[PDB]
Each structure stands twice: as C-alpha cells, then as structure tokens.
Design a protein around this ligand. Structure first.
Ligand SMILES: Nc1ncnc2c1ncn2[C@@H]1O[C@H](COP(=O)(O)OP(=O)(O)O)[C@@H](O)[C@H]1O
Ligand code: BEF
Ligand SMILES: [Mg+2]
Lengths: 50, 210
C-alpha cells in the first residue's frame, strides 16, 4: 500500500516531460525575439531534444 | 538608416561615415564590409535598418536579396529570407523587395527581412495578384519609340538615322550583327540616352556581359 508500481507508459511520459522542459526553455528563449508576421509555429521547435 | 543611401555613395563617403562611427581603420575592407560594419554600429545604438534587394532562390529553399553594387552576387550586404516569407507573400526570383531589415542576430551572419514595404514598387496586395509571364499573350508594337532627340548635335546622327533605318517599338526583338571595333559601344550609349530623353517613363536596363 505504500509501494507504487509504474509501468512503461509512466516512465515514457516522464522522459517526454523531461525533454519537453528543455524544448520549452528553448522556445521561450527564442520567443524573446519573435514578433508578428515573422515566423510560422514550426521553426521555433526542434526535434533534437525530445 | 536606409541601405540605398549607403549604396549611392562612393568609397570615401563610407570612409568618413565609419570615422564618424568611431570605427577602426576601414580602408582595407570591401565596400560591402564597410557597409556591414556601419550598419552593425548603427543598430548597436538600438536602430532598425531599411533595405532593398532583388530576390533570388536556389533549391535550398530560402531566398537572398542582392544589391546592384556587386551586380547581384552573394555578399555581406545581401539579405537572407526564410522560405516561409516566399510562401506567404508569393515571392519569386527577380522580385525586387524593399522594407525593414535587421543586422544578423546571435549566431547569424547575413541580414534578415522583418516587414515587406514595397514589392516591385507596389503594395503586397496587387503584388500577390500578379499575372504570370508565360501565361500572357504576346503582341506586336504600335507604340513607336522615337529615337530622335530634336537637338541635332554632332552625334545625334547615329540616333536619327535609325528613325529611317530601323524603327524601334516597345517589345521589339532586335539583334545587332556587327564586327568588333566598329562603334557598337557608343551606339548603345546613344540609344540609351535617346530613349531616356524621349521616354523617361520606361525603366532603363543595360546588360554589360563579359
Ligand atoms: N559618332 C562618332 N563620332 C566620332 N568618332 C566616332 C563615332 N563613332 C565611333 N567613333 C570612333 O570609333 C571608335 C569606336 O571605338 P569602340 O568603342 O572600341 O568601337 P566598338 O563599339 O565597335 O568597340 C572610337 O575610337 C571613336 O573615335
Ligand atoms: F567591338 Be569592340 F570589341 F567593343
Ligand atoms: Mg564596343
């Protein structure tokens, strides 16, 4: 009752969030320059980290 | 600042401008390097840039806005634009674009366009609604391009003679068949001067190849 079991899905989601926090920091530091009519919501996201 | 006002000035003007900007001895670099350094120094004070360049695309997808200083070649003054802008504003090669640009930001090395202002001296509205070239219908010329100046100087002969030898019309397909060292250089000089005097509305273009 005090020991919890975690499956593959839970750790996969945890690793996804660990990568997403890095991607979020990246998109935040890149959003410091982005203005209107300058970019589509595709170039600010890289596939590398996650 | 505007880029064209750095375009039309000679090298000594750039020298004194850089001396005004408190820059290192810049007599060693290319004119475009001087323009790049001056634009960087100007934007370091928190300023935006205004540029004008003819657009060119490779298979790489993104576009480059070249100036007439290097006769439309790669250089530190040309502007880099993403394929997204070409997809949005319906851009293509040869489309001269003027508007706001910024110096290369952190990690960048060429200029980037911010907001388009004049697409071929036109608003993006009718620039996006552009008729295709090859989809047009060719015709023949009724508008006669008068080559006579009317002043009647010593050289104007070479122009007025065409008025009786080879009539010139708008959209004419003309070709000169001539041996070297015969007088073609001054001939085209005369024709350019005459068309500019009699018809200043049409944009003049001269091709100096090889
Ligand atoms: N209208 C003219 N009046 C006087 N001299 C002329 C005239 N047209 C041509 N010439 C002479 O012919 C020469 C043409 O030189 P160049 O420009 O090398 O010929 P091309 O145009 O065939 O290369 C010049 O040296 C010039 O003295
Ligand atoms: F005819 Be020359 F070579 F200009
Ligand atoms: Mg010649």
């Amino acid at each position: 009752g005090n020991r919890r079991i975690r499956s593959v899905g839970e750790m996969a989601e945890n690793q996804f969030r660990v990568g997403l926090v890095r991607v979020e920091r990246a998109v935040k530091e890149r959003l410091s320059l982005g203005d209107l009519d300058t970019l589509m919501p595709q170039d600010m996201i890289n596939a590398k980290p996650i | 600042m505007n880029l064209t006002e750095l375009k039309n000035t000679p090298v000594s003007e750039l020298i004194t401008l850089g001396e005004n900007m408190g820059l290192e001895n810049l007599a060693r670099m290319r004119k475009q390097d001087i323009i790049f350094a001056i634009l960087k120094q100007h934007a370091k004070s928190g300023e935006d840039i205004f540029g004008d360049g003819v657009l060119e695309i490779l298979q790489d997808g993104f576009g480059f806005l070249r100036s007439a200083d290097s006769s439309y070649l790669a250089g530190p003054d040309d502007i880099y634009v993403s394929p997204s802008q070409i997809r949005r504003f319906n851009l293509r090669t040869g489309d001269t674009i003027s508007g706001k640009i910024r110096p290369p930001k952190e990690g960048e090395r060429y200029f980037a366009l911010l907001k388009v202002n004049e697409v071929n001296f036109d608003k993006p509205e009718n620039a996006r609604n552009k008729i295709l070239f090859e989809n047009l219908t060719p015709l023949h010329a009724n508008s006669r391009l008068r080559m006579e100046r009317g002043n009647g100087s010593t050289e104007d002969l070479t122009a007025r003679v065409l008025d009786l030898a080879s009539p010139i019309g708008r959209g004419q397909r003309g070709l000169i068949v001539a041996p070297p060292k015969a007088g073609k250089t001054m001939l085209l000089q005369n024709i350019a001067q005459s068309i500019a005097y009699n018809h200043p509305d049409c944009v003049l273009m001269v091709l100096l190849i090889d």
